[PDB]
Amino acid sequence: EVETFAFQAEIAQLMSLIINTFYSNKEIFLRELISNSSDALDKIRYESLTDPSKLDSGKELHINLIPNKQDRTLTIVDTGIGMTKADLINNLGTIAKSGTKAFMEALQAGADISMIGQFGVGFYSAYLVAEKVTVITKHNDDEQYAWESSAGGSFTVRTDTGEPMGRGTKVILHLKEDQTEYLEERRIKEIVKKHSQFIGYPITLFVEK
Numbered sequence: 001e002v003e004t005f006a007f008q009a010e011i012a013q014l015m016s017l018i019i020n021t022f023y024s025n026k027e028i029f030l031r032e033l034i035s036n037s038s039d040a041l042d043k044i045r046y047e048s049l050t051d052p053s054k055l056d057s058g059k060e061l062h063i064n065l066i067p068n069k070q071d072r073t074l075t076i077v078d079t080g081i082g083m084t085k086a087d088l089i090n091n092l093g094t095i096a097k098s099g100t101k102a103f104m105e106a107l108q109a110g111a112d113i114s115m116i117g118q119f120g121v122g123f124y125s126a127y128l129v130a131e132k133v134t135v136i137t138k139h140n141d142d143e144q145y146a147w148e149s150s151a152g153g154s155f156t157v158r159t160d161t162g163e164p165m166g167r168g169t170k171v172i173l174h175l176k177e178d179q180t181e182y183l184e185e186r187r188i189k190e191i192v193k194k195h196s197q198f199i200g201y202p203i204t205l206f207v208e209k
């Protein structure tokens with residue numbers, strides 16, 4: 001049972017800009033996704049200060065980077081607060097709409113794509129390198145869900161039947177054909193050190209077999 005939703009016109013028109021605009025500095029997608037993971041870890045950590053039972057779904061707060069050359073996928077895993085069903089359909093779209101509109105006014109006023117994080121819509125930077133993004137998320141107050149979109153104006157939301165996650169968000173980037181450099185070990189290390197050096201959570205690179 002999969003529900004298909006239409007992107008808001010402002011968001012879909014931002015995603016088409018990100019996918020079609022010639023922009024070589026694509027490496028900033030990792031900074032934006034890690035920064036989003038850092039924010040999610042900050043939220044569950046703050047909640048645990050007054051309610052230790054919020055960590056019953058997982059005490060460790062970290063970010064894991066899992067490249068896969070065979071599947072041509074780069075996975076960013078965090079144990080943050082996760083996302084509810086209302087987040088994936090209603091709440092985050094409201095924040096995305098106001099942030100997208102402001103980001104696009106700035107893009108016409110000289111700003112470039114790399115400043116997407118200053119508007120709170122840094123997740124859409126994943127489509128600089130990915131032709132399809134699958135998001136597995138689990139919130140303490142909801143069930144595990146699967147978000148997926150190949151852009152094109154629509155996304156899907158469904159209950160995830162796969163491996164239980166406990167708590168957090170897993171972003172699976174199905175990379176484009178010419179973006180496989182972000183599956184290399186030394187390339188990921190250079191980007192993490194350059195852009196995410198001061199993230200207050202351990203970022204572990206899972207190196208392949």
Ligand SMILES: Nc1ccc(-n2cnc(Cl)c2Cl)cc1
Pocket residue numbers: 036087088089092093094096123135147169171
């Ligand atoms: N509308 C809307 C829904 C989810 C997101 N989102 C942010 N981080 C991840 Cl992962 C996802 Cl999915 C963004 C916008």
Ligand SMILES: Nc1ccc(-n2cnc(Cl)c2Cl)cc1
Pocket residue numbers: 036092093095096120121122123124
């Ligand atoms: N709380 C909260 C979580 C994620 C986002 N977010 C990031 N990238 C996009 Cl797109 C969105 Cl929406 C915004 C707020």
